Structure 1
Amino acid sequence: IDPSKIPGEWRIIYAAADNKDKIVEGGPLRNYYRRIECINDCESLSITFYLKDQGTCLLLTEVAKRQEGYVYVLEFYGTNTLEVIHVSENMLVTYVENYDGERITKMTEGLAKGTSFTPEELEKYQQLNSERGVPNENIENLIKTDNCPP
């Protein structure tokens, strides 16, 4: 984890979750990333993304506060803990636990600088999912349905 690689223009390639309904088209956790900013050394993260809501691309910017290390807290369709578990020049993987007042959803997001992952990057992402109990069969390719403004 090189914290300096966190801010930047990122595209979301994949999302995986135990409660798949949360990430399918029309799900509250299907978020089309555009950019991540660090508020003066990343004590807080400013995340800008599109939510395809009501057949409209809605631009949203949410702020997550650092809790400990690279674990941040964010209120977004419930309470969330977002952890940066892997960050490189071209790849970023987040681990999110969302509590909607009824159930906890464990999910991951694989972001890239490009529009895809090489087999080696996908192998790593799938491995990080297994370690957390997030089913690889529940993987969704988000960039293929990202028709929101670039």
Structure 2
Amino acid sequence: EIDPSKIPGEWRIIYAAADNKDKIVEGGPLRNYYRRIECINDCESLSITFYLKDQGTCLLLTEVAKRQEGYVYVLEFYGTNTLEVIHVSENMLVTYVENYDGERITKMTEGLAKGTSFTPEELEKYQQLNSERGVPNENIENLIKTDNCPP
């Protein structure tokens, strides 16, 4: 059960995982450094602020994802995406994204944090969510360690 009151916040991304790992490694289009999620009209839309890093340059973007059904949203960004908020707590948010780039479908997750770094229970929860959705835990990338764009 998703509590929409917990969705908004100054989130940072710790981990991402994808079946097509090339999408989320450094230089990949779906390696996105979160800064903020804002709910618009009671989460009818999510306004998501994040950085892309390209050739050493930090690109600060805000993209708006529109509600499709429940907490599944849609946005065009390097292809057609659905983005689902699959877990949210006071300190953790996990997304599940399906991206179609005209050639491949990519299934991926993002593990976002507030406060201190992911605990062991948070790490395990993230891996369990991945396994439930067929996203390989062997394809987990640590994003926070390469996030050197402005706070």
**Which band: TM-score by shorter chain?**
over 0.9
Corresponding pairs, count = 150
Deviations 1:126-150 (A, max 9, x none): 0000011000000011000000000
Shift of 1:125: 0.4
Task: Please name the residue that 1:10 is paired with.
Answer: 11
Percentage of identical aligned residues: 100
Deviations 1:85-136 (A, max 9, x none): 0000000000000000000000000000035210100000000000110000
Structure 1 unaligned spans of 5+: none
Q: Secondary structure at the match of 2:78?
A: coil
Task: Please name the residue that 2:32 is paired with.
Answer: 31
Contact 1:17 1:134 in 2 (8 A): yes
Task: Please name the residue that 1:57 is paired with.
Answer: 58
Contact 1:11 1:115 in 2 (8 A): no
Q: Please report the TM-score for the alignment, with normalisation by the length of structure 1.
A: 0.98
Residues of 2 paired with 1:31 and 1:82: CA distance? 13
- Distance of aligned partners of 1:88 and 1:107 in 2 relative to their CA distance in 1, 3 Å threshold: same
Deviating beyond 3 angstroms after TM superposition, the runs of 4 or more aligned structure 1 residues are none
Shift of 1:55: 1.4
Q: Please report the TM-score for the alignment, with normalisation by the length of structure 2.
A: 0.98
Contact 1:13 1:115 in 2 (8 A): no
RMSD (Å), alpha carbons: 0.7
Contact 1:115 1:143 in 2 (8 A): no
